[PDB]
Amino acid sequence: MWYKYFSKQSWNLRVWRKANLKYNQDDFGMTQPKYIARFGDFRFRLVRTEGALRGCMFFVGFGCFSIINYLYGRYGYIINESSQKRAAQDLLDNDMAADKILFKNRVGAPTRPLRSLDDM
Amino acid sequence: LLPRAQFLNLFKYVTRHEAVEPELEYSKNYFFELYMASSVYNALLNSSAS
Amino acid sequence: KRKKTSGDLDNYDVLFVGANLGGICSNHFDKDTHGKYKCFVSFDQPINQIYSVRIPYEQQRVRKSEYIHFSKKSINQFTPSEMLAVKEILPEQNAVVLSSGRRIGYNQLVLATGLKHDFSQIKGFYEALEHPEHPVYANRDPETWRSAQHKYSKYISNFKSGDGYFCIPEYPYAGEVECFNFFVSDEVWKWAQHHGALSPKHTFTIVNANEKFVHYCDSADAFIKERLEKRGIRVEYNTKLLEVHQDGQKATFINTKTGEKSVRDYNNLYSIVPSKRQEFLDKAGLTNGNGLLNVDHQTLQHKKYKNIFGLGDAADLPTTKTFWAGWYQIAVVRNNVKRNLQGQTLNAHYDGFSKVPLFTGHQTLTYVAHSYGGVGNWQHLKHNNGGILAWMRYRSWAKGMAKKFQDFYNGARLGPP
Amino acid sequence: TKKQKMEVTLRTPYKEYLANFDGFSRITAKTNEASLVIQNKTPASLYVLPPGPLKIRFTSEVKNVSGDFLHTGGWVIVHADNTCEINVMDLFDRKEVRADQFEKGNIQDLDTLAGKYAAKSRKSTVRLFTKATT
Amino acid sequence: HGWTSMLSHAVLLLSCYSIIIMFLFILGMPTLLLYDFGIFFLAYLKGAGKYISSVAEMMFDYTACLVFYIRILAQWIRVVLMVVTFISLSHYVSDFDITNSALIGSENQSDSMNELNTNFSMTYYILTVLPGKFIYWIYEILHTFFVVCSQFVAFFAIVFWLFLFLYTFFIIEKHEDFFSKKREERKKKLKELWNLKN
Amino acid sequence: MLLVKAVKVLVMGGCMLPIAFGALGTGVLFAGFNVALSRNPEETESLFNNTLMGFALIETFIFMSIGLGFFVLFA
Amino acid sequence: MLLVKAVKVLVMGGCMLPIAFGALGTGVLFAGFNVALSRNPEETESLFNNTLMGFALIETFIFMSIGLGFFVLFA
Amino acid sequence: MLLVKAVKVLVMGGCMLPIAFGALGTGVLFAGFNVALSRNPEETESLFNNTLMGFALIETFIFMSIGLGFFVLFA
Amino acid sequence: MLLVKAVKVLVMGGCMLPIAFGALGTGVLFAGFNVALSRNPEETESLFNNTLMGFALIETFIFMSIGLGFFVLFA
Amino acid sequence: MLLVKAVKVLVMGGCMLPIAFGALGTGVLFAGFNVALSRNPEETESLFNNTLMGFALIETFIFMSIGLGFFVLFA
Amino acid sequence: CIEFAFKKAGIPIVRNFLHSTEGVIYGLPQRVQRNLAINYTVKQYKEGKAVSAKTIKTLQEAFPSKGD
Ligand SMILES: CCCCCCCCCCCCCCCCCC(=O)OC[C@H](COP(=O)([O-])OCC(O)COP(=O)([O-])OC[C@@H](COC(=O)CCCCCCCCCCCCCCCCC)OC(=O)CCCCCCCCCCCCCCCCC)OC(=O)CCCCCCCCCCCCCCCCC
Ligand SMILES: CCCCCCCCCCCCCCCCCC(=O)OC[C@H](COP(=O)([O-])OCC(O)COP(=O)([O-])OC[C@@H](COC(=O)CCCCCCCCCCCCCCCCC)OC(=O)CCCCCCCCCCCCCCCCC)OC(=O)CCCCCCCCCCCCCCCCC
Ligand SMILES: CCCCCCCCCCCCCCCCCC(=O)OC[C@H](COP(=O)([O-])OCC(O)COP(=O)([O-])OC[C@@H](COC(=O)CCCCCCCCCCCCCCCCC)OC(=O)CCCCCCCCCCCCCCCCC)OC(=O)CCCCCCCCCCCCCCCCC
Ligand SMILES: NC(=O)c1ccc[n+]([C@@H]2O[C@H](COP(=O)([O-])OP(=O)(O)OC[C@H]3O[C@@H](n4cnc5c(N)ncnc54)[C@H](O)[C@@H]3O)[C@@H](O)[C@H]2O)c1
DSSP: OOHHHGGGGGGGBBBSSSBBBBBOOTSSOOOOOOSOOOHHHHHHHHOOOOHHHHHHHHHHHHHHHHHHHHHHSSSOOOHHHHHHEEEEEEEEHHHHHHHSSSEEEEOOOOOEESSSTTTO | OHHHHHHHHHTTOOOSOOOOOOOHHHHHHHHHHHHHHHHHHHHHHHHHHH | OOOOOOOSBBBBBBEOOSSSTTHHHHHHHHHHHHOOEEEEESSSSSEOGGGGGHHHHTTTOOOOHHEEEEHHHHHHHOEEEEEOOOEEEEETTTTEEEEEOEEEEOOEEEOOOOOOEEEGGGGHHHOOOESSSSSSESOOTTTTTTTTOGGGHHHHHHHEEEEEEEEEESSOOOOSSOOOOOOHHHHHHHHHHTTTSOOOSSSEEESSSSSOOOOOHHHHHHHHHHHHHHTOOEETEEEEEEETTTTTTTTEEETTTTTTEEEESSSSEOOOOEEEHHHHHHHHOOOEETOOOOOOTSSSSBBSSTTTEEOOSSSSSSOOOOOOHHHHHHHHHHHHHHHHHTTOOOOOOOOOEEEEEEETTTTTEEEEEEEEEEEEEHHHHHTTTHHHHHHHHHHHHHSSSSSHHHHHHHHOSSSSS | OOOSSSSSEETTTTTEEEEOOOEEEEEEOOOOSSSSETTOOOEEEEEEEEEEEEEEESSSSOOOOOOOOSSSEEEEEEEEEEEEEEEESSOBBBBGTTOOOOSSOOOOOOSSHHHHHHHHHHHHHHHHHHHHOO | OOOSSSSSOTTTHHHHHHHHHHHHHHHHHHHHHHHOOOOTTHHHHHOOOOOSSSHHHHHHHHHHEEEEEEHHTTTHHHHHHHHHHHHHHHHHHHHHOOOOGSSSOOTTTTTTTTTTOOOSSSSHHHHHHHHHHHHHHHHHHHHHHHHHHHHHHHHEEEEEIIHHHHHHHOOOOSOHHHHHHHHHHHHTTTTHHHHHTT | OOOHHHHHHHHHHHHHHHHHHHHHHHHHHHHHHHHHHHHGGGGGHHHHHHHHHHHHHHHHHHHHHHHHHHHHHOO | HHHHHHHHHHHHHTHHHHHHHHHHHHHHHHHHHHHHHHHHHGGGGHHHHHHHHHHHHHHHHHHHHHHHHHHHHHH | HHHHHHHHHHHHHHHHHHHHHHHHHHHHHHHHHHHHHHHHHGGGGHHHHHHHHHHHHHHHHHHHHHHHHHHHHHH | HHHHHHHHHHHHHHHHHHHHHHHHHHHHHHHHHHHHHHHHHHHHHHEEEEEEEHHHHHHHHHHHHHHHHHHHOOO | OOHHHHHHHHHHHTTTTHHHHHHHHHHHHHHHHHHHHHOGGGHHHHHHHHHHHHHHHHHHHHHHHHHHHHHHHOO | OOHHHTSOOOHHHEEEHHHHHHHTTSSSSSHHHHHSOOOEEEOSSSSSSOOOOEEOSSSSTOOOOEEE
C-alpha cells in the first residue's frame, strides 16, 4: 500500500537524468529563439538541453583557447612577422628623428619637449 | 451588507481615490466601520420612529 | 498653440473609416493641409496587428510589443477618434450612421475598412486556434492571448509527425504573399527528417480554394508553383476548409469545383483567416460583385458619389493587396481629396505598385514587385534561389521593419519617398 | 461623467449642517500625517481626520455657522464627480470650547498595550485643543 | 594556543597549519558543490541563456563561475584586516614607554639614570603627554575590537551562511506522508487511556 | 608605444568606476526593498526574488567591464 | 600618430562610463519595481515585463557605446 | 618604465573611488531601513537581515576592487 | 624615486574622496532617522541604535582607504 | 624633489572636497529635520539633538581630512 | 496616533475618537455630552442564560481590542 501514502504533489516535476522534462524551453533560454539555422538546430537536437551544452562547452573552451594560444606561439609569425619588422625599424627611425629635433641640455636629457608642436 | 472579509479584499483594489494620509491597510478597516455603522444607525431611527 | 478639434459634432468636411490606413492618411492629410480641415475617424477594432512581419514574428525575430499596436496610435492627437463601426452609409444625404446611431455628415469620405476577418466561416476554428495546445494555427493572434502565450511560434517547431495542411481561403482574402510560410517550413522540416525529429511518414499539402496563388501577377504565381514542384510539395486546388473538429482532429474539406467534401485527419493545420463582405457597403450600392469597392484604378475615386474614395484592401484594384501598395494609395487619396475640397482636378494617378516579400527560406526572401499589369520592376523575383544578397535583405526586413511601424503611426517617418 | 463646479456635504449623526453647498471657496483640515486643503477640482481621494480643527471659507456668510469648528473625528471622501463629503462624529464651534474643563475624572487609564495608544490619542487632543483655541 | 608552547619550537605552529587547512577546505567547498550539480552546474549559477550562440554564453558562463569563487576568495581580505589591525596594536604596546622613572629602586644606572635627559615635548608630562599616549592606546584597541568582531562575523555569515542560502535550498513538496495518518489511528487506539487523564 | 602601454594600464583603473556605481546601485536597490517590504510584507518572495535578479544585472555590467579592461590591456 | 593612438585606446576606456551608469540605472528601476509591486502586486507580469523591457533599452545604449568604441579604435 | 610604474600606483588610488560610493550607498541603505523600520516595526527581523545582507554585497565589490588594484600594481 | 613618490602622495590625496562621500551618506542617514522617528517615535531607541550602527560601517570604508593610502604611500 | 612638494600642496587642496560634501550633507540633514519636525513636532527636542549629533559626525570627516592634509603636507 | 493604535492594538477608529474625547467630554458643551453615551444590554439567548450590560464603551467592553 505504498501508493496509498505516496503524495501526488511530487508530480510538479518530471525528473529524468537530472533534468525536469516540464521545462518551457520554447519560451526561456537558448532554445527559445526559433530563427536558429541548421547547425544550431542539429546541436540542440543532440543534447536536448542548454544546460548540458553549456556545461560541455565550458571545458571545450579551455581546450580550444589553450590550443590556439599554443599555435599562436609555435606558429603565428606567418602573418605577424612583417608587422614586427616594420615596427622594429619604425621604432628606430622615429628615435633617430627625435635626436635631430629635440633640445638636449649639457646632459643628454630632453628637458624641453613642449618647446614646439613638432617636439611634443 | 457584505462582511468584513469580502469588503477588505474588495476595498484593497481601490485606486481611483487616493488614500495616503492614512495608509490603505488602515483606511480599509476604518471605512468598513463607516459602511456598517451608517446602515445600522439609519435602520434604528427608522424602526424607532415606526 | 493649435487646439484639438471636437469629436462631438454633427458633420465634418472629411471622414475616414479605418485606422490602419485611414489613420496614416489623416496624419498625412493634415501635414499636407496644415490642419485647415476637421477630419473624423471611426474604426472597429482597437488593435492592429502588423501582418507584414507575421513570418518574422513566428520566427520570434520580433517581440510581441512590436507586432501589436493600438489603433489610436495610427491616428494623430488633433483628429478625434471613436471605436464605433458605421451601421450604414447614405451617399444621397452625405452622412454616416454609427452603431450607436448618431448621425454624422461629411463632405469627403475615405473608406479603408479593408477585408474583415470572419472566423465563423470555419466551424470550430477559433475555438481550436485559441487552445494553447491544439495544433490548429492561423494567420493572426486572437485577442484573448496575453504576452506569455507563444503558440504562433510552435507551428513549425511542433510538427513531429502527422498530416499537415496549409489552407488558403477563397479570394478576396488578406495576406496573399505576406503570409505564405510554406517555403520556410519546408526547409525547417527538411532538417527534422535528416536527424529523425520528424517522422518519415508525414504529409504536407497546400489546400488552395482558389485556382491560383497570386491572381494579379502571373510571373509571381508561376515562380511559386514552379518552386513548389522543385521542392516536392503537393497542392490541391478548388478545395477550401469547411469545418474543424477539435476533439478527434478532423478537418472537413470540400472541393468547390466538384462539390465533393471529405474528412481528413490532421496534426498540424495552418489557415489564412477568411474574409467576409460587409452588408452595409452593399445596402448603399457601392461594392461590385466580390464585395470590393467599385472605384477608379488611377485616381481611386468612386465611380458614382465623387465625394467618396477608397483604398487598401476593400478597393477593387487589379493588384496585390499589400501595405507598400497602400503607401502609394495614401498619397493619391490625400491629393484627390485635397483637390475635391478645392474643386480642382485630380492630378494624382496610381500606377498599381505593390511590393511584398516572399520568404523562400529560413533566412532568405525575394520581393514580389508588380504594377497594375503584373509587370515587375528591377526587384521583381530577384535573388529568389537564395544567397548572400537575399540573406542581407532578410535581416533588413526582419530586424528593422517592426521598429519603423512606430514612426509610421507617429508621423516621424513617411512612406518610401 | 462630470458634476457642476462643486458641492460639499457636512453631516453629523445628530444634525445636518450643509446638505449641499457651493458658495464655499476652500476647505482645510489636519490629517494624521499633515494638513491638507480640499478645494475645487481636487482629485478623488479618501481621508480620515482625527479630532482636529476644520476651517472652511465662505464667499457669503452662512447663518448659525462661524466657519471654524473642532470635530471629534470623521471620515472624508472626495468622489470622482468632483464632490467631497465630510462626516464627523460631532461638531461644535471654538467659542463653545469652554477650555480649562479638561481632566475632570477621566485621567485614570489601564496599563495595557491598547490603553497606551488610547491615552496617546487623548493626550494629543489636549495638546491640540489648547492650540486650537488660539 | 597556550598549552602548545612546549610541544614545538614555534608557539603558533598549530595556528599556522590550521590557517592553510582552513583555506584549502574552504576553497574546495565551492568545487564539490559544482560537482554535485552535475553538467548543468552553470544553469544553477546563472540560469537560462539569452543568445543562441554557445560561444557568447561561454563568456557569460565563465564570469558566473569566477564570481562563484570571488564571493569566497574576496572574503579573505577581511582576515588580512584582522591581522594588520592585530599587529598594529602589538607594535604600539611592545614599543610603549617604559623607563627607570617608573621603576622602584632601579639598579640600571647605565640606562639613562645618570644622564641629562631633556625633551622638546609639552611639559606637565603626566597631564598632557602620557594621557595622550593612553588615549591613542584606547583607540588602537577599540578599533581592533570593532574590526575583528565585525569582520569575524561577516566572514562566516557570507562564506557559509549566505553562500549556501543562495545556491542551495530545501523543497516543500513531500513524497510520503504516512506518519500523519498513523498518528490519527494510533490516537483512537489510546482513546480510553487518555480518558483516564493518563 | 611606451605611452600607449601606460594608457592601457590607466584604462584598466577606469574600469573601477562601475564598481563604484554598482555599490551605490546595490544599496539603493536594497534600500527600496526594505521600504517595499515594510509597505507589504506579505509578498516577501516576489520582492526578494526581483531584488537579486536586479542585483544580477547590476553586477553583470561590472564584470563585463572587467573583461573589457583586460581586453584593452592586452589587445 | 601614436598620440592619436593613445587617445583611441583612451576613448575605448571611456565606454565603461555608461556601463557604470547602466548599473546604477538598473538598481533604480528595479528599486521602483519593488515598491510598485508591494503597492499593487496584482499586475506582476505587467510591471515585470515593463521592467525588463526598459532594461533592454539600457543595454542598447551600452552595446551602442561599445560598438562606437571599437569603431573609433579601428577607424 | 618609470612612467608605467607611476600609472600603476595611480590606478591603485582609483580603487578608493568605490570605497567612497560604498559609504554613500551604505548610509542610504540604512537611511531607508530606519524609514522602512518606522513604517512597520513588527517585521524588523526580516528588514534587518536583508539590510546587512545587501551591505555584504556592497563591500564585496569594494574588496573586489582592491584585488584588481594590487593586481595591476604587481601584474 | 621622488617622481614615483610624487604619484604616491598624489594617490594618498585620493583617500579624501571617501572621506567626502562619507559625510554626505552620514547626513542622509540621520536625515532618514529624523523623518522615520517622526512617523513612529515609540521606538526611538531602536532607530537610534541602527543609526549609529550605519555610521560605523561608513568609517569601516573610511579607515580602510586610509590604510590602503598609507600602505601604497610606503609600499 | 620640487615636484613632490607640488603634489603635496595640491593634495592639501583636495581636503576641500569633504568640506564641500559636508556642506551638502548638512543641507540635506536639516531639510529632513524640518519635514520630520512638521510630521511630529511633539519631539522637537529629540530630533533637534539627533540633528546636531549627525552634523558633529560630518565634521569628523572634516577633521579627519584636514588632519590627514597637514600631515601629508609635512610628512 | 490613529494608525498604529489599530495596527499594534485592536482599537477601532470609533473607539479611538471616544478615548480622544474622553479627556475633553467635560470641556465640550452638554449637547455633545449627551451624544457620547452608549448603554445597552446583550444576552446569550437561552431562557435565562446570560444578561450582560454594556456601559463602559471605552475599555474592552463595547469595542474590544487586542491590547486589552
Ligand atoms: C585567422 C586566424 C585563424 C587561426 C586558426 C587557428 C586554428 C583553429 C582550428 C580550431 C578551430 C576552433 C574549433 C571550433 C569547433 C569547436 C566546436 C565549437 O566551438 O562549436 C562551433 C562554433 C559554433 O559557433 P556558435 O557561436 O556557437 O554559433 C552561433 C549560433 O549558434 C549560430 O546560429 P545559427 O546556426 O542558427 O545561424 C548562424 C547564421 C547562419 O549561417 C548560415 O546559415 C550560413 C551557412 C553557410 C554554410 C556553408 C556551407 C559550405 C559547404 C561547403 C561548400 C560546398 C561544397 C563544394 C565542394 C567543392 C569541392 C572543391 O546566422 C547568422 O546570421 C549569424 C550572424 C551573422 C554572422 C556574424 C559574424 C560575425 C563576424 C564579425 C567579424 C566580421 C568580419 C568580416 C570581415 C572578415 C574579413 C577577413 O563555431 C565557432 O565558434 C566559430 C568561431 C567563433 C569565434 C568568433 C570570435 C572571433 C570573431 C570573428 C573574427 C573577427 C576578425 C578578427 C581578426 C580580423 C583580422 C583581419
Ligand atoms: C591546474 C588546473 C586547475 C583547475 C582545477 C579544476 C579542478 C576541478 C575539479 C572538479 C572535479 C572534476 C572531475 C569531473 C568528474 C566528471 C565525472 C563524469 O564524467 O560524470 C559525468 C558528469 C555528468 O553527469 P550528470 O550531470 O550528473 O548527469 C548527466 C545527465 O544525465 C546527461 O543528460 P543528457 O544525456 O541529456 O546529456 C547529453 C550530453 C551532451 O553532451 C554535449 O554537450 C555534447 C558535446 C558535443 C560532443 C561532440 C558532438 C560531435 C557530433 C558529431 C556528429 C557526427 C554526425 C555523423 C552523421 C552520420 C552520417 C552517416 O551530456 C553528456 O552526456 C556529457 C556530460 C558529461 C561531460 C563531462 C565533461 C568532463 C570534462 C572534464 C575534462 C577535464 C578533466 C580533467 C581531469 C584531470 C584530473 C587529473 O559530469 C559532471 O558532472 C561535470 C561536473 C564538473 C564540474 C567541475 C567544475 C569545477 C570547476 C572547474 C573550473 C574552475 C575554474 C576556476 C578555478 C579557480 C581556482 C580553484
Ligand atoms: C579687585 C580685584 C583684586 C584681585 C585681582 C586679582 C587678579 C589676579 C591676576 C592674576 C594674573 C595671572 C596670574 C599669573 C600666575 C599664574 C600662576 C600659574 O600657576 O599658572 C601656570 C599656568 C601654566 O603655565 P606655566 O607653568 O607657567 O608653563 C608655561 C607654559 O604653560 C609651558 O608651555 P606647555 O605647552 O609645555 O604647557 C602645557 C599647557 C597646556 O595647555 C593648557 O594651558 C591647558 C589649558 C587648556 C584648557 C583651556 C580652557 C580653560 C577654560 C575652562 C573654563 C571655561 C569656562 C567658560 C567656557 C565657556 C565657553 C564659551 O599648560 C599646562 O600644562 C597647564 C596645566 C595646568 C592648568 C590645568 C589645571 C587647571 C585647574 C583648573 C581647576 C579649576 C577649578 C576652579 C579653581 C579656580 C581657582 C584655582 O599658566 C596659566 O595657565 C596662566 C593662567 C592664565 C589665566 C587664564 C584665565 C582662565 C579663565 C578661567 C575661566 C573660569 C573663571 C572665570 C572667573 C572670572 C572672574 C571675573
Ligand atoms: N495578412 C492579413 O491577414 C491582414 C489582415 C488585415 C490587414 N492586413 C494588412 O493591412 C493592410 C491595410 O489594411 P486595410 O486598411 O486595407 O484594412 P484593415 O485590415 O487594417 O481594417 C480596416 C480598419 O477599419 C476598421 N473597420 C473595418 N470595418 C469597419 C466598419 N464598418 N466601420 C468602422 N471601422 C471598420 C478596422 O477595424 C480597421 O481599423 C493591408 O494592405 C494588408 O496588407 C493584413
